[PDB]
């Protein structure tokens, strides 16, 4: 019945995300969202709820408009960061597994087509935000979309999130400074967790 900072799935992602950067992003930014949300939900319908309710809280707070905006920003950021950490692994990146190949090829023309769409989307999100690989139920295909600030596919009907890459400047600044492209390159090359993507498409019954 309080929000908590959930454990990382790994000890680190060096040398791609430095020890210092991981510490500041996780124990600094992500931890602070958890603290702030605990403070904000007091006296509201969300008091005494835990991490499993985060998805529900995001949608309800967003629908509330002005009354729910701070709660939305913080709940959404916690949910987004949890998703981000699961979206990477040590020895990640590279080509998708065999069981994903056709869907990737169908949706983006080729692996290189995917890398290009993902990179374009990341450099295209002006200011703070997130890049998502999603399954679009109406297109019957994978898509790349970006969101501003704390927005996510939880806000959009028919769009199942599969992986995310944080493009808030704090996600990469300490290691890559203003070179967001260098960080995006590294994400695709060595971080993206295809086991997570695949596992979620299997859970949703898509594959
Ligand atoms: Fe972040
Ligand atoms: Na959705």
Outline the structure in words.
The PDB classes it as oxidoreductase. Keywords: ssgcid, gram-negative bacteria, human granulocytic anaplasmosis, Fe, metalloenzyme, Oxidoreductase. The assembly is monomeric. The protein is mainly alpha-helical and 207 residues long. The protein has one domain. The protein is built from eight helices and three strands. Bound molecules: fe (iii) ion (FE) and sodium ion (NA). The site of sodium ion (NA) has 4 residues, from loops.
Describe the strand arrangement of the main beta sheet, using strand numbers.
2-1-3
Largest sheet: 3 strands, antiparallel
Strand runs, count: 3
Kindly, what is the distance between the CA atoms of the first and last residues, rounded to a whole number of angstroms?
35 Å
Helix content: 40-55%
Give the cofactors and ligands: fe (iii) ion, sodium ion
Number of helices, where a helix is a run of at least 4 consecutive DSSP H or I residues: 8
Please state the CA-atom Rg, rounded to the nearest Å.
17 Å
Counted up, domains total: 1
PDB class: oxidoreductase
Keywords: niaid, ssgcid, Seattle Structural Genomics Center for Infectious Disease, gram-negative bacteria, human granulocytic anaplasmosis, Fe, metalloenzyme, Oxidoreductase
Assembly: monomeric
Entry title: Crystal structure of iron superoxide dismutase from Anaplasma phagocytophilum
Layout of helices and strands, plus pairs?
Elements: H1 19-40, H2 54-63, H3 69-86, H4 98-108, H5 111-124, E1 129-136, E2 141-148, E3 159-166, H6 173-176, H7 180-191, H8 194-203
Antiparallel strand pairs: 1-2, 1-3
Helix pairs in contact: 1-3, 2-3, 4-5, 5-7
Residues 25, 29, 81, 166, 168, 170-171 line the site of fe (iii) ion (FE).
Domain Manganese/iron superoxide dismutase N-terminal: 3-89
Pfam families: Sod_Fe_C, Sod_Fe_N
Family: Belongs to the iron/manganese superoxide dismutase family.
């Amino acid at each position: 019945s309080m929000f908590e900072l959930s454990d990382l799935p790994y000890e680190g992602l060096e040398p791609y995300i430095s020890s210092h950067l991981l510490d500041r992003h996780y124990n600094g930014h992500h931890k602070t969202y958890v603290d702030v949300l605990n403070k904000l939900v007091v006296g509201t319908e969300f008091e005494g709820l835990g991490n499993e309710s985060l998805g529900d809280i995001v949608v309800k707070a967003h629908n509330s408009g002005s009354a729910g905006r701070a709660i939305f920003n913080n709940a959404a950021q916690i949910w987004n960061h949890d998703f981000y950490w699961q979206s990477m692994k040590p020895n990640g990146g590279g080509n998708p597994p065999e069981k994903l190949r056709e869907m990737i090829e169908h949706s983006f023309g080729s692996v290189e087509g995917f890398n290009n769409a993902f990179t374009t989307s990341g450099l295209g999100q002006f200011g703070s935000g997130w890049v998502w690989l999603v399954y679009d139920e109406d297109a019957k295909a994978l898509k790349v979309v970006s969101t501003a600030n704390a927005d996510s596919p939880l806000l959009t009907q028919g769009q199942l999130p599969l992986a995310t890459m944080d493009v808030w400047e704090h996600a990469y600044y300490l290691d890559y400074l203003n070179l967001r492209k260098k960080y995006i390159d590294v994400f695709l090359e060595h971080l993206l967790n295809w086991d997570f993507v695949l596992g979620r498409l299997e859970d949703a019954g898509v594959l």
